[PDB]
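Consider the following assembly input.
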Amino acid sequence: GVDLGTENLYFQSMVNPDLMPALMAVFQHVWTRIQSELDLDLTPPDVHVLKLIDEQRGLNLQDLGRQMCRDKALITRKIRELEGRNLVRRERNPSDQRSFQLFLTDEGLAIHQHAEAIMSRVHDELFAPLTPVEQATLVHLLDQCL
Amino acid sequence: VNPDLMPALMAVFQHVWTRIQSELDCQRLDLTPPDVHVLKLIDEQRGLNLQDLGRQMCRDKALITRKIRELEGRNLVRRERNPSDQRSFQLFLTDEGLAIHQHAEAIMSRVHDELFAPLTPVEQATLVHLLDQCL
């Protein structure tokens, strides 16, 4: 028959079937605007990598991997592509014998700041039709999912 | 607009993407969350063309063709010329593509249920309603 790996053929899902399509439709509205106003093929994980490097000055490949829940080999490949596009740079860590730390270049920081500005602008427009009470309910519900 | 809204929604998008990607990695499905969705759209809309896939994925012709050629290279998807319009391709899953789609669908069924399990059915309906008001 059909191989489902470690999945159960009788698994019963109870999630509201409109939840994942509603969140993906919101994601598409946000991502389309980011892609259009940036204009280089940055993917949503690329944008998150830049954010983590900017917010955690000098973090290493192991800590980035752990935060992205991706294996060290996959995240190093991603960093080498971003290095190639002059968005990220590796610097020798002084507190070690031979290890490296990640930093954004001037171009990498500029892309991160611009994308963040687009996100801020697009979210303001998208959720303006919600009343302050509905916005607080939305925050509370999104926070419960972590 | 509530200043905690954009960070909360972006943390949820990032948490959902990360969880799906980890679950696919854990069972060695060499797929990303948009690939899973591409396979689903091809399976549910038999013989859909590349233009209609592009529109549904919100991707220009160049990016969606690249994605389909990578899946074709992995023998998951088949491109067939539309007999009524030889300039256009119709997309189908191969036997291997269908098998990977069915496995990915059983993972997503469990993963989607686990991701929103912290919300009660009433809270999930409220979340849908609030997201829908923004279209």
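The first strand of chain B starts at residue 77 and ends at 82. Ask yourself how this observation constrains the way the partners meet.
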